[PDB]
Structures are given as structure tokens and as C-alpha cells.
Amino acid sequence: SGVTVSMADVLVPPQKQEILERHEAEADAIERKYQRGALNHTERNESLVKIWQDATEEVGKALEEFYPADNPIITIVKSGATGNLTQTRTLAGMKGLVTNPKGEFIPRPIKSSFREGLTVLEYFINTHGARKGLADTALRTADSGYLTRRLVDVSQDVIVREHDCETERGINVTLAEIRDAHVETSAFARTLATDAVDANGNVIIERGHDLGDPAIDALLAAGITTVKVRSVLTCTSATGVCAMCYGRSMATGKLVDIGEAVGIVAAQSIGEPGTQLTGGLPRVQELFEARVPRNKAPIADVAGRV
């Protein structure tokens, strides 16, 4: 493929010198607003951050317009093999706003990029956000492991005990009420609790079916929006759960075998992520532990006017 990295292949867009000054000049005028005093100081930083964190997007599009589609660095990212556009922007262009140790965005951005090289003060400021992020991934594994252990222990004895419990109960999946963003995780790989009926009318998919991809489109064609589906929540199995309620085994791609220990598989399926969780592990623990919400929100006690 002739994909290498070189000094030349990392090209800085030429529209970047003007663009900063364009945004820089918008900072001396908010200095006028600060020097005028009509707006508070925290509003000064805010207006500074919004204008600066805009220039970042402008140099982003600026960078992309300049790169040839066959550039080795862009080809790496385009193919989906590895990389991010954010990382490419920090390589050539400008790093952008960085974190203060306390957690608030600095109003001052790092105009230089690691290609042009940072300065003494620019490098120093970045160490705050670089180290603070490297310690977050240090204790992230300890809390995720303790969460995975509680998931495993609460669900370890949950295994499939019979092919079918013959219950008619189920749950309604939303299924594209345009297609719903996530039917792959909610509707796909399920088993129909009841026959899929079109108005008034025709039955397009019978109950007790696996709901493969072709089933969805065919279903999707008939104009149906919702489907009742088997779930372990409604499974009436005396011990453990049944194969029809659990549905397809994600590994085998077929109906779950009888002996499958799905409780542990679930605890691990939820436990492997969490190193990727950064609105994160605290919220997930709050839900499974069923604690009073951090900031409680009210629900309607009855239907009517408000």
C-alpha cells in the first residue's frame, strides 16, 4: 500500500494563520466588553471559550479541504483501521483548548500544533490535562473491576434450564417509530411473543421467530412500528430462564444452548466496557444499586393537565 509517515505527509493547512487572527481579534473585542464591564468575568471566559472552541472546528474543516484523499495519514483514518480526526487536528493545525487541573477550560488556547512544536508555556499547560487524563484511566480499572464482580455474583446462578416456558407475556420494542437508532440491541436477536400482524390484516411474521435482518426489512416494509417480544423479564421459568425467552446466542448466532450460563455472560458483557466509560461508571453503579438518584426527578402520579 505504500503507507508511511513522513514530515512532508503531515501538512499544515495554509488558511490557519489568518483564521486564528480572525478569532484572535474577536478576543480583543471581548476584552473591550470586559474592559467595558457590561458583562461579568465568568461570561468573559464563556464568550472566549465559545469563540475559541469554534476556531477549532474552522481549522478542522480547513485541514480536511487541503489534504489529498490519498495522503497516507488520511487513508489510515478513512479506512477505519485506526485513528481519529481529533488526533489529526492536534497533530497538524492546533491542539485547541485544554483542561485546567481544577477542571475548567482555559480561555487561552494552544495555537501551535505538535507538528510546529509547542513552546515552554504551551507544553506546560498541556501537562495538566495529559496527566489528569492518565490518572483517570488509572483508577477507572479498579472501579470497573469491583462493578463487574458485583454483576457476576448477583447473576452467576442464572442459567437456561428449559427450551420453552410457553408464556405469552412479553415486552414491546419501539422498532422505528424512519428506523429507530438502536434496534440492533433491542429488537434484533429477539423472539416474537405474538404473530406480527399487518392491518387489518395480513400476518407477515409468525410468533416464535428469531427476527433476523431480513425479518426486520420485511417487517419494516409492512408498515409495522412496534412488536411484542419475549424477554427474560417476563420469562415464567421456575428455575433460571428458558431458551425461547433468552433468544439467539450472540456468539453462536443461533438459539441459545440449554446449558448456557447467561448470567455470567451478561455480567461480563456489561463488565468489559467501563474502561471506555468516562454520565459514566458512577451513574451505572447508581442504577444497578437502585440508590436514590443523585439529582431526583419527579414523575407524574396520574394523567391529566399540568
Binding site: 503507507v3 509517515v5 503531515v10 489529526t88 497533530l91 505538535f114
Partner: peptide, 15 residues
């Protein structure tokens, strides 16, 4: 390998 160079921001090694 080429793929490990761009993502890690250690391009000083290319210099």
C-alpha cells in the same frame, strides 16, 4: 509499523 505513529502523538520520533 506505520499505523502506530500517527495516533499516539509521538511524531517527534519521525523528526
Amino acid at each position: 509499523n506505520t499505523h502506530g505513529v500517527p495516533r499516539r502523538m509521538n511524531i517527534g520520533q519521525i523528526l
